[PDB]
Structure 1
């Protein structure tokens, strides 16, 4: 068995190996990358996502979200408070202000300590889930707006044509902006490219151990757990690495820098934070190996999780017994 300790693997494809996306994901899996739940891909030195980032200030963040925490430093939830619209230029200025800027620090490890110690006492503002792309249309390799669609994958594997579309999303982050513990919708893969700015630290639980994290979460968030059998789908709960270690939950951590891709694998729980002003792009995707995960994915039917139009067909076709109850939660 490849990668039996479920360590996060880092890949350095050549320009020739960067041509065929599907083939390279399958190569990474042949080496056991999926066992970690997360992999890093450093693009060949010849590659670029676009020529420059000098002209992105007029992008609009229609609904910036202030991330307000409740709980204790290591075990907290966050809610999102909607703020007034601002441009990327305005947001970048805010991120760099004395109220929100990254503090002085020695290294990534010192910054991680400061995050976990102090996150709950501040409410950073995140520009999330903005439909769009920063890849140049002429970038032919690993362009997140030109991937094969999950609808076409389900049709190729299962023979059924379905409605829906699959497009990327932009994330503009600042110091302490936070992504809560989750897997993807329908336990899909995700791919994330850090276009510019400061790093993003990730934590991940190997897929084979995801139920251990779920059990701890039910213990640590007991009201939430009573309200919904799949409440991590709400994307609001944070658990620190110190707490995970104290409770014997297997996990790994890695920092992604600008110009690097991360891939999350089916049923790989992940969480993390941004180091300072940055812009990432991400999208879900599928492979043939995903289908069995899609069939078994938990669902939130309490009404909180509320998801895209395109998840309907995945539930309908892969989870027909669940469909009626899940759709009630959507309505």
Structure 2
């Protein structure tokens, strides 16, 4: 068995290996990368996503989100308070202000210490989930707006044609902006490219151990657990590495820098934080190996998780017994 300790693997494809996206994902899995739940891909030195980032300031963040925490430093939830619209140039200036800017630090480990000590005492503002792309149309390799669609994969594997579309999303971050513990919708893959700015630190639980994280979460968030049998689908709960270690939960960590891709694998729980002003692009995708995970994915039916149009068909075809209840949740 390849990668039996489920370590995060880092890949350096050549420009020739960067041509065929599906083939390279399958290669990474042949080396055991999926066992970690997360892999890093450093693009060949010849590649670029676009020529410059000098002209992005007029992108609008229609609904910036202030991430307000409740709980203790290592075990907290966050809710998202909607703020007034602002441009990316306006948001960058805000991120760099004395109130929000990254503090002085020695190295990534010192900054990580400061994050977990102090996150709950601040409310950073995140520009999340903005439909769009920063890849140039002429970038032919690993262009996250030109991937094979999940609808087409389901049709290729299972023969059923379904409605729905699959487009990327932009994220503009600042110091302490936080992504809560989650797997993807329908336990899909994700791919995330950090276009510019400061790093993103990730934490991940191997897919084979995901239920250990879920059992801890039910213990740590007991009210939320009674409310919903899949409350991590709400994407609001944080648990620190110290607390994970105290409870014996297997996990790994890695820091993504500008110019690097991360891939999350089916049923790989992940969480993390931004180091300072940055911009990322991410999208979900599927492979043949995903289908069995899609069929077994948990679902939120309490009404909180509310998701895209295109998840309807995935539930309807892969999970017909659950469909009626899940759709009641959506309506």
Tell me which interval the TM-score lies in, with the shorter structure as reference length.
over 0.9
Other structure's SS at 2:262 match: strand
Give the drift of 1:24: 0.0
CA distance in 1, matches of 2:86, 2:230: 34
2:74 and 2:161 mapped to 1: Cα distance? 45
Cα deviation code 1:263-318 (max 9, x no counterpart):
00000000000000000000000000000000000000000000000000000000
Q: Deviations over 1:101-155 (max 9, x none)?
A: 0000000000000000000000000000000000000000000000000000000
Q: Distance in 1 between matches of 2:308 and 2:326?
A: 13
Shift of 1:181: 0.1
Could you tell me which runs of 5 or more consecutive residues in structure 1 were left unpaired when the two chains were aligned. none
Other structure's SS at 1:300 match: coil
Is 1:231 aligned with 2:261? no
Q: Deviations over 1:54-101 (max 9, x none)?
A: 000000000000000000000000000000000000000000000000
Q: Secondary structure at the match of 1:4?
A: coil
SS at match of 2:70: strand
What is the CA deviation profile of residues 1-53 of structure 1, one whole-angstrom value per residue up to 9, with x for unaligned ones?
A: 00000000000000000000000000000000000000000000000000000
Partner Cα distance (1:287, 1:167) in 2: 16
CA separation in 1, counterparts of 2:209 and 2:283? Answer: 24
SS at match of 2:193: strand
SS at match of 1:152: helix
The answer as to 2:287 corresponding to 1:287 is yes
Q: CA deviation at 1:326?
A: 0.1
Query: For 1:98, what is the secondary structure of its paired residue?
Result: coil
Instruction: Extract unaligned runs of 5+ from structure 2.
Output: none
CA displacement, residues 213-245 of structure 1 (integer Å, 9 cap, x when unaligned): 000000000000000000000000000000000
Instruction: Let me know the Cα RMSD of the aligned residues.
Output: 0.1
2-side partners of 1:330 and 1:157: how far apart?
A: 27
The equivalent of 1:215 in structure 2 is 215
Shift of 1:192: 0.0
User: 2:111 aligns to what SS in structure 1?
Assistant: helix
